[PDB]
Amino acid sequence: FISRFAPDQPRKGADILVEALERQGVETVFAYPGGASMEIHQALTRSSSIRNVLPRHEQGGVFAAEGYARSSGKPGICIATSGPGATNLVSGLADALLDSVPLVAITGQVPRRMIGTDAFQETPIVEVTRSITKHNYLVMDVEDIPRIIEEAFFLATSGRPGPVLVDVPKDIQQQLAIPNWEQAMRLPGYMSRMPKPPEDSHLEQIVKPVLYVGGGCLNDELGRFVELTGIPVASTLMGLGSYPCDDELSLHMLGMHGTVYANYAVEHSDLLLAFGVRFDDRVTGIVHIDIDSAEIGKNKTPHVSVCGDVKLALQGMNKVLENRAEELKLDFGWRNELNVQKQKFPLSFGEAIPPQYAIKVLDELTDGKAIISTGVGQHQMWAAQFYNYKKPRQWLSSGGLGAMGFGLPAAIGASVANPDAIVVDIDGDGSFIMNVQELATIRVENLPVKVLLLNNQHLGMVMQWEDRFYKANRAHTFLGDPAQIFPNMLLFAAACGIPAARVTKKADLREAIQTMLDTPGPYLLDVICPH
Amino acid sequence: FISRFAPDQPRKGADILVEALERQGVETVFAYPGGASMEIHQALTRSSSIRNVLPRHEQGGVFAAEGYARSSGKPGICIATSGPGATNLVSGLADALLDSVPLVAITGQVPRRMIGTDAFQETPIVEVTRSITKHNYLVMDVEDIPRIIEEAFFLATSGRPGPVLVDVPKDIQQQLAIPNWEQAMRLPGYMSRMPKPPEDSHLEQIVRLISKKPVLYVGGGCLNSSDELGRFVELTGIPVASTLMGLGSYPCDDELSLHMLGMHGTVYANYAVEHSDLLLAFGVRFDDRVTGIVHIDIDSAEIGKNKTPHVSVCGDVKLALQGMNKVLENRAEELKLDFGVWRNELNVQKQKFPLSFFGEAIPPQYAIKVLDELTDGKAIISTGVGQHQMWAAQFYNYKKPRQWLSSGGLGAMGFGLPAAIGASVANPDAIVVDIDGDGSFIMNVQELATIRVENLPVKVLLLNNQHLGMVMQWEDRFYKANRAHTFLGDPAQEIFPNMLLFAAACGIPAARVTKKADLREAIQTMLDTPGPYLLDVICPH
Amino acid sequence: LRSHTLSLLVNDIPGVLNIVTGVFARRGYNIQSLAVGHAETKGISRITTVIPATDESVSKLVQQLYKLVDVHEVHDLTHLPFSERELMLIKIAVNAAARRDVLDIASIFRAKAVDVSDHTITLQLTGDLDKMVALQRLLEPYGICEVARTGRVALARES
Amino acid sequence: KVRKHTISVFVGDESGMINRIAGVFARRGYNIESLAVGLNRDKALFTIVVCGTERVLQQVIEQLQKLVNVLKVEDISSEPQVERELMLVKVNAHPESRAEIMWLVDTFRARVVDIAEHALTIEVTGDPGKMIAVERNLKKFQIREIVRTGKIALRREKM
Amino acid sequence: KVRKHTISVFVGDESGMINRIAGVFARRGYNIESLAVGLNRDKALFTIVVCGTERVLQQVIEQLQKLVNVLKVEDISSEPQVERELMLVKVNAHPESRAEIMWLVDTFRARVVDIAEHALTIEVTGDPGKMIAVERNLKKFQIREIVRTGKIALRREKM
Amino acid sequence: LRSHTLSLLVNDIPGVLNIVTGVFARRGYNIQSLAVGHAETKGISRITTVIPATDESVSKLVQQLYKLVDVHEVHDLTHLPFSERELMLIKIAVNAAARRDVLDIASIFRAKAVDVSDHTITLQLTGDLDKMVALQRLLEPYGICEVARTGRVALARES
Numbered sequence A: 001f002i003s004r005f006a007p008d009q010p011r012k013g014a015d016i017l018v019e020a021l022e023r024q025g026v027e028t029v030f031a032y033p034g035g036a037s038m039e040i041h042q043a044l045t046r047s048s049s050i051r052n053v054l055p056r057h058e059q060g061g062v063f064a065a066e067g068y069a070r071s072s073g074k075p076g077i078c079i080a081t082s083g084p085g086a087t088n089l090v091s092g093l094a095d096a097l098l099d100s101v102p103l104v105a106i107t108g109q110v111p112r113r114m115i116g117t118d119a120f121q122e123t124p125i126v127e128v129t130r131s132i133t134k135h136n137y138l139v140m141d142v143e144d145i146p147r148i149i150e151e152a153f154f155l156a157t158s159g160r161p162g163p164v165l166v167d168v169p170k171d172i173q174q175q176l177a178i179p180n181w182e183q184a185m186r187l188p189g190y191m192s193r194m195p196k197p198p199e200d201s202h203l204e205q206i207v208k209p210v211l212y213v214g215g216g217c218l219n220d221e222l223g224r225f226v227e228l229t230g231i232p233v234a235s236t237l238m239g240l241g242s243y244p245c246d247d248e249l250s251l252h253m254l255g256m257h258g259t260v261y262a263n264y265a266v267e268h269s270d271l272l273l274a275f276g277v278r279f280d281d282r283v284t285g286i287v288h289i290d291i292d293s294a295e296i297g298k299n300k301t302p303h304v305s306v307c308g309d310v311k312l313a314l315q316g317m318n319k320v321l322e323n324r325a326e327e328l329k330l331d332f333g334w335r336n337e338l339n340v341q342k343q344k345f346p347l348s349f350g351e352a353i354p355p356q357y358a359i360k361v362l363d364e365l366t367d368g369k370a371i372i373s374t375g376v377g378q379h380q381m382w383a384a385q386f387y388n389y390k391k392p393r394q395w396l397s398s399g400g401l402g403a404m405g406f407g408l409p410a411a412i413g414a415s416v417a418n419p420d421a422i423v424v425d426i427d428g429d430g431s432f433i434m435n436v437q438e439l440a441t442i443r444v445e446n447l448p449v450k451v452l453l454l455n456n457q458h459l460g461m462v463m464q465w466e467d468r469f470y471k472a473n474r475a476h477t478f479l480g481d482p483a484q485i486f487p488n489m490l491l492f493a494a495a496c497g498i499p500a501a502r503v504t505k506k507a508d509l510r511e512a513i514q515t516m517l518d519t520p521g522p523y524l525l526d527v528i529c530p531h
Numbered sequence B: 001f002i003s004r005f006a007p008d009q010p011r012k013g014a015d016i017l018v019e020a021l022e023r024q025g026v027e028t029v030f031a032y033p034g035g036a037s038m039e040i041h042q043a044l045t046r047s048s049s050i051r052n053v054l055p056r057h058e059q060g061g062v063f064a065a066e067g068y069a070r071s072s073g074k075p076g077i078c079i080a081t082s083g084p085g086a087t088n089l090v091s092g093l094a095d096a097l098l099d100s101v102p103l104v105a106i107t108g109q110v111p112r113r114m115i116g117t118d119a120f121q122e123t124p125i126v127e128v129t130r131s132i133t134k135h136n137y138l139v140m141d142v143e144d145i146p147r148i149i150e151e152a153f154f155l156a157t158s159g160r161p162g163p164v165l166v167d168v169p170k171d172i173q174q175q176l177a178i179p180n181w182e183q184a185m186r187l188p189g190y191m192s193r194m195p196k197p198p199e200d201s202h203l204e205q206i207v208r209l210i211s212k213k214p215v216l217y218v219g220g221g222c223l224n225s226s227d228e229l230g231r232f233v234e235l236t237g238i239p240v241a242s243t244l245m246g247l248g249s250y251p252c253d254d255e256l257s258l259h260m261l262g263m264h265g266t267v268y269a270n271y272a273v274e275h276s277d278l279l280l281a282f283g284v285r286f287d288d289r290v291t292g293i294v295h296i297d298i299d300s301a302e303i304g305k306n307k308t309p310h311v312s313v314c315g316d317v318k319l320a321l322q323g324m325n326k327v328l329e330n331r332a333e334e335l336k337l338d339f340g341v342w343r344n345e346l347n348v349q350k351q352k353f354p355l356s357f358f359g360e361a362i363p364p365q366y367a368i369k370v371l372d373e374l375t376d377g378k379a380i381i382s383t384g385v386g387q388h389q390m391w392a393a394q395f396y397n398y399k400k401p402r403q404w405l406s407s408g409g410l411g412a413m414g415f416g417l418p419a420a421i422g423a424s425v426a427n428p429d430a431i432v433v434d435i436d437g438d439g440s441f442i443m444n445v446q447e448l449a450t451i452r453v454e455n456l457p458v459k460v461l462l463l464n465n466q467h468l469g470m471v472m473q474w475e476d477r478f479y480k481a482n483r484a485h486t487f488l489g490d491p492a493q494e495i496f497p498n499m500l501l502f503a504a505a506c507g508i509p510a511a512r513v514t515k516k517a518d519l520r521e522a523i524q525t526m527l528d529t530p531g532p533y534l535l536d537v538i539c540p541h
Numbered sequence C, F: 001l002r003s004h005t006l007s008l009l010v011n012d013i014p015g016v017l018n019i020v021t022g023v024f025a026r027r028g029y030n031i032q033s034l035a036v037g038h039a040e041t042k043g044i045s046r047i048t049t050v051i052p053a054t055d056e057s058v059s060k061l062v063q064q065l066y067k068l069v070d071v072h073e074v075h076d077l078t079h080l081p082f083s084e085r086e087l088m089l090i091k092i093a094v095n096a097a098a099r100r101d102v103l104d105i106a107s108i109f110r111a112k113a114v115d116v117s118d119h120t121i122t123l124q125l126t127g128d129l130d131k132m133v134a135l136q137r138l139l140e141p142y143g144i145c146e147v148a149r150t151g152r153v154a155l156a157r158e159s
Numbered sequence D, E: 001k002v003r004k005h006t007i008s009v010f011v012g013d014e015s016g017m018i019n020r021i022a023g024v025f026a027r028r029g030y031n032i033e034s035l036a037v038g039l040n041r042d043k044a045l046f047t048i049v050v051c052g053t054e055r056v057l058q059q060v061i062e063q064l065q066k067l068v069n070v071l072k073v074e075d076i077s078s079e080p081q082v083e084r085e086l087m088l089v090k091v092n093a094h095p096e097s098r099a100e101i102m103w104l105v106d107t108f109r110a111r112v113v114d115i116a117e118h119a120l121t122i123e124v125t126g127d128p129g130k131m132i133a134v135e136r137n138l139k140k141f142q143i144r145e146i147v148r149t150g151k152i153a154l155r156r157e158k159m
């Protein structure tokens, strides 16, 4: 590290923090100006390495920092001003804590002497967030900033990843002090509980089976293990991409919206390798390997369970299998019976476009290599089932929270993290309009984001619970004007100087999708569908 | 009340709740559908008296329920699904608790057996909100619903008003049970502390104190006492200074209305305070924007909070003014109150420092003087948080209370457009005008589609300047004009976005205006056109 | 349900009790008594609590508590052999004649008198919940004014 | 003028009451030295000990009255009062050490709760000044564990 | 589920009554672990302790009612009850051993009955848990003889 | 004013107490209690006293006392940590019925009886001023005859 100040020069706490971030390898932050963040924003302008991206609404900021953190694996960062700013973040933190995504939020706070009185824009944000974050800190002394920031990045990344928050009073941000980059972490409880490396005796004990993998497998070893075993793999809505969807053994999504053959596989399996999963009710309606000792036995009691990083467990088992593969002579050619089920219940759907065809076309026109983000609607299930992901992180979606509006900003995060990737946002009608105001930001950065809108003039997924269970009764699920596409999203694109088109025909759509992929820079495609 | 069910017919808890709301005089609710609120939404469709309004974003819903509650004085209501729905309400509740606005929020929750498992969309919303609400309940039994709802409406309205929240597990909403509309409130601590009527001995001591340079200082606490205050001003002739929340409580056009005081307040009102000899702090909390003594308040906690008063009284200012009005009336001729010297000296200051503000490059203060003139100062005005809020507060003559709707202590951006919806539902035939900066505006621009769904006659006045103006000012004033990205246009060029197209997308007529001489007719064209309209006013940054 | 005892050691940061009590309240469990105080070393406090629960649910709750950054360790004591004590102060409205009677009960319980007025007296007692409730049930005929109970405190016995 | 004030709070019972009470001090960043509470019947009485200024106390002692389910609140610290703490301690006790420590317990009017050859459990009760004297004496012995309730208090009834 | 139940039996007196009572347990091959009785006037109250299942107890506790001269029978084991044992022990006591054992008796509130230079007789009384603790302590001393009564019990009168 | 305690050592010459009491009476200060007696060595006496004063005026008065030829040393104890005790005898007119009641109070205060007649009884008490005045205030209903209070005695504690 190269310091902009002398090793003994006293400087503002703000610059101390900025340096602490640069020292941690920070490169881009999402932030919004306001009366409690001016010091930080001015320091971010004095810095040269960290890029600043200003979204239109703070909830867009936190979602962009989440898209960035999910696609790059790097810890995402977002900053906001006290009061109303901070409170807008809550919808983000509640998502991060549910998907185990590392994220660090920093906020400005009222002067220390003003805390507790209800001063202008004062808010107990620490007390509001205490129950929905992995840990959080109130900075009472500039001298702890280096240690606090370090501990924070460590906590965010170590163990099960999760969001963390640090609040800094304005006067502490202005206060001049001398840093100290050498200090120890004070985590004596947490450190003592950090998972020890896996024990080979269990790996050897592990040596109609089905592999069940989820978000815990995000970090080759599984593919190698599949070679040493030839076992069929079932993946969750979060496990997608961890295993190539085009492989013969990839059973795609399992569960309630999952593939029928994968569900049959589970229904008739004899050995379940629950590696990196939490037995979510959408899946459940046994061998467990996990880093989180709390998930062990949480929803269902396993026959065998191991605490520790699945990565090391797979490397160990891969060696144990390699030195004994010829002795074990594993064979489950169960595989045929399940293939027969694939043949008996394969996936399926005039000019009134099938949305599944829009996804099949987009997969094949992009080698299944493009980065996908979604809202939360019928379109989230279709874009999960019908697109063949070939890398992890190609799929970005709200797993457990189900937060509408997630799409567009998560596409921004992914575009900043992967400057040259093909980024396509596949979105609901309801899910799109909730954050349509962020389109302005794309024009400011000229990001080549591709927007695909599955327009059917309704809050769509709720209308499936109407038409399946509540006797098709309309609880206002229709979003159009009863007297007569509303709004004309073409005009929305026009307002941003972004080229766009509307499509209605199955016969036009293949050329239209290719037109958006051909067109340099950003584009909007409005796919008019039957409800 | 007329029940849709037999007095002994067991029915779903959802219908029990709906009936409990109808029994409380509920008329319209802002709600958003989702997997934990379907039961409630269905019951709301089976009901006939309560109208449902569906906004585009939940944080629009809570701001409409706040606009409705502020303009009508009635307790506002909003409903939302669990998880991401509930969490988006937090920005509203934090506002209500800062402005003492009564509001009741109801939300659906995961089945009881699932709580604490981290189930799909589960969120400890009770624990998240516990520190920012007057009280909150977790409904553990359908049988308490009648009592809980009653207690809630009472708490929301009684004492210092404030927001309250009730969370109901889905299975309890479906559970069939027999109601009981007769049950007592369990509020022993709170009830025991409710303020007793004011004591006349203090009113008479106040009359005694009523001085040579007195000033009346009133804020949001005077909302329900405009007539009594006007009468008191007759019995005294004392000049009145009003806060950004006190506006409308006292006619701005009266000779004694000094308008806003403080950091942005009028220079003459600030001189008045600087040289006053007796301060009647009635319904105020000594906020730092005002402060940088007689105190009357319902909230015993505000007494002596920021500054120690010489005399203080706990109780409703309404009763204190009625009592003092009688005490003064029976002795007005004996007291012979007179402050002409002080009143004149201050008028001299008015003359020396009157309210004041480059070719066709529009003065926005003139745009607001025109807006007052063309609306008799009678319209409902709503505002964001930038420079535009200060101008609309200073340069418009409010004649009645509740004419001014703005975020006071919290300052939440995006408040305008949904608060205009609330006021428009509460006052079907009023003129509603929403005044905004383009930073304060764009954060909630997704709500414009709702206006077309309801065909509401809302008038939007966008004071466009392509910057975050209030932020861009404190840079140019203090932080050496240096820029934390305070520009929101495209550097390569023109107004961005073209808000005309945003109106066009909703089939709403609109206009753009750039020059001082057109503006007076452009505002009149917006006021004359039936139904909704948008005027985009282009200003120098 | 049945009542259980938890003993917890905590990293003694300002505000940590709010984090811990939030976990019980998020499961909805009503803590019947709590005591918190300095442990054997500078920089640690012990919390001890009684809750109505299942021995299944406490096992889930102690697993759940280990997710906190600021716990050092947590124990159920309920199935173990443990020593237990509890302290109580009680005030009573009493006249000179009844004072005799009350002093008799006190002597039986081995209660120590600790305040007197010819209006009222107060007694100190130590023991366990059965003697506590027994006494508080026996003194009902007199105007019992208030009862400042500590909640239990416990330690396992290795014997 | 940092001082170790003590507040007593009287309440009607609800799930999460200790979490509302602990939130008002956590929101300041103030530190609770000790807190003790036991659910008496339908109602409960806290006694709590905190470090800070008498200025900021007037805020937190006012803000506690805003809660709908608090019945009464007092700063007890200046008034004439009964005041007691229960402490419990386990200490290693070699047969010789068993000889002197016997002289100590025989002094403080302490009781022994259980015995093992490695350690003993002792129950100690009295005024906080005796508690500190005891701690300074035990400092010379190999403590094994200690736990204590925090000071309970009640006002003395002057005529 | 072998458990160590206790039964209490109230009788009108006849010569050989204990022999009928002891026959019903001997017939099963059951074991009387302890038994105590004394003729109070014209009537007597046994308390007895046995090992086995709650199933077979229902047979022998029924078969005891077939006797013409039993007045009442109860299984007392589950109820809230007063319970006590008397024990008496003679132990060798060398002048030094006399020093530590004094510390023990001074702990358990034991009394000394008679003295000789070779041995002492001690009287011990309390709950069975104290009795076992005492035995585990005396294990380290040269016992000479011991005898014990077996537990007496009575139900506590709840209101 | 506030009360202060002075401890003085003096040459024990015949008539020295007149010199010392002259210094207080020349300032006009009304001594609340005084006790004088032999110190730790032959040829020295200790005087101990209580006076209402300012902690300014006691500093002037101890400087003033050093001018005396017959003093060895003088101390204020008031701001120091010091142990304190006081002795009282009290006589009461009491009949056989009230004698019961009085013995009850005595037992509570841990007062020891020391004279009896069927006309009157006298009690001995030791402690500190609050128990002294409390007892004297409580026995008012009976014909309290006389009180022979010693005044306080104090020594600093080095701990």
Ligand SMILES: Cc1cc2nc3c(=O)[nH]c(=O)nc-3n(C[C@H](O)[C@H](O)[C@H](O)COP(=O)(O)OP(=O)(O)OC[C@H]3O[C@@H](n4cnc5c(N)ncnc54)[C@H](O)[C@@H]3O)c2cc1C
Pocket: A098, A099, A100, A159, A160, A161, A213, A214, A215, A216, A217, A235, A236, A237, A238, A239, A253, A254, A255, A256, A257, A258, A276, A277, A278, A279, A280, A281, A282, A283, A289, A290, A291, A292, A295, A308, A309, A310, A311, A376, A380, A398, A399, A400, A401, A402, B120
């Ligand atoms: C309407 C809707 C319906 C849905 N229906 C389905 C459905 O039918 N099927 C389906 O699969 N999903 C569905 N989902 C998604 C669902 O909410 C859950 O996310 C999913 O069932 C389980 O996610 P997971 O276990 O794979 O990841 P999660 O457990 O939610 O998150 C990541 C996991 O990774 C583990 N982990 C993290 N780091 C490590 C590490 N280093 N080492 C080991 N482990 C680690 C964590 O402990 C955690 O368990 C649906 C979503 C929606 C919105």
Ligand SMILES: Cc1cc2nc3c(=O)[nH]c(=O)nc-3n(C[C@H](O)[C@H](O)[C@H](O)COP(=O)(O)OP(=O)(O)OC[C@H]3O[C@@H](n4cnc5c(N)ncnc54)[C@H](O)[C@@H]3O)c2cc1C
Pocket: A120, B098, B099, B100, B159, B160, B161, B218, B219, B220, B221, B222, B242, B243, B244, B245, B246, B260, B261, B262, B263, B264, B265, B282, B283, B284, B285, B286, B287, B288, B289, B290, B296, B297, B298, B299, B302, B315, B316, B317, B318, B385, B407, B408, B409, B410, B411
């Ligand atoms: C950028 C910005 C700048 C600002 N600058 C200024 C400025 O220069 N000047 C200015 O005036 N404001 C300004 N404000 C607003 C100011 O900061 C406070 O938010 C405002 O004063 C709050 O309103 P209030 O003081 O009247 O009390 P409120 O917050 O509205 O509280 C209501 C009061 O009424 C009392 N009350 C309620 N019912 C009764 C009753 N029945 N009887 C008696 N009392 C009752 C309550 O207890 C309480 O004291 C500014 C706001 C912003 C966004």
Ligand SMILES: Cc1ncc(C[n+]2csc(CCOP(=O)(O)OP(=O)(O)O)c2C)c(N)n1
Pocket: A375, A376, A377, A378, A379, A380, A402, A403, A404, A427, A428, A429, A430, A431, A432, A454, A456, A458, A459, A460, A461, A462, B032, B033, B034, B035, B081, B084, B085
């Ligand atoms: C914030 C929030 N509000 C409401 C819901 C409930 N919900 C789930 S998906 C959905 C509608 C999906 O419609 P759309 O976004 O248009 O996608 P589509 O179903 O047409 O594919 C709703 C209202 C939610 N998940 N989150």
Ligand SMILES: Cc1ncc(C[n+]2csc(CCOP(=O)(O)OP(=O)(O)O)c2C)c(N)n1
Pocket: A033, A034, A035, A081, A084, A085, B384, B385, B386, B387, B388, B389, B410, B411, B412, B413, B436, B437, B438, B439, B440, B441, B463, B465, B467, B468, B469, B470, B471
């Ligand atoms: C959510 C939130 N973010 C930031 C602020 C700080 N803030 C106050 S006014 C303002 C913007 C001012 O510009 P604008 O709202 O467009 O109106 P203008 O000042 O030009 O009149 C900002 C960022 C805030 N109050 N709330």
Ligand SMILES: CC(C)[C@H](N)C(=O)O
Pocket: C010, C012, C013, C014, C015, C016, C017, C018, C036, C045, D030, D031, D032, D033, D034
């Ligand atoms: C241990 C606990 C009471 C801590 N001192 C707190 O203030 O939260």
Ligand SMILES: CC(C)[C@H](N)C(=O)O
Pocket: C029, C030, C031, C032, C033, C034, D011, D012, D013, D014, D015, D016, D017, D018, D019, D037, D039, D044
């Ligand atoms: C009174 C208190 C101990 C309450 N039962 C709680 O759980 O918070």
Ligand SMILES: CC(C)[C@H](N)C(=O)O
Pocket: E011, E013, E014, E015, E016, E017, E018, E019, E037, E039, E044
């Ligand atoms: C009652 C009993 C001791 C009887 N006298 C017997 O001899 O059996």
Ligand SMILES: CC(C)[C@H](N)C(=O)O
Pocket: F010, F012, F013, F014, F015, F016, F017, F018, F036, F045
């Ligand atoms: C010490 C004093 C009382 C002395 N013996 C005197 O006679 O004066």
Ligand SMILES: [Mg+2]
Pocket: A377, A378, A428, A429, A430, A431, A458, A459, A460, A461
């Ligand atoms: Mg939809």
Ligand SMILES: [Mg+2]
Pocket: B386, B387, B436, B437, B438, B439, B440, B465, B467, B468, B469, B470
């Ligand atoms: Mg603006």
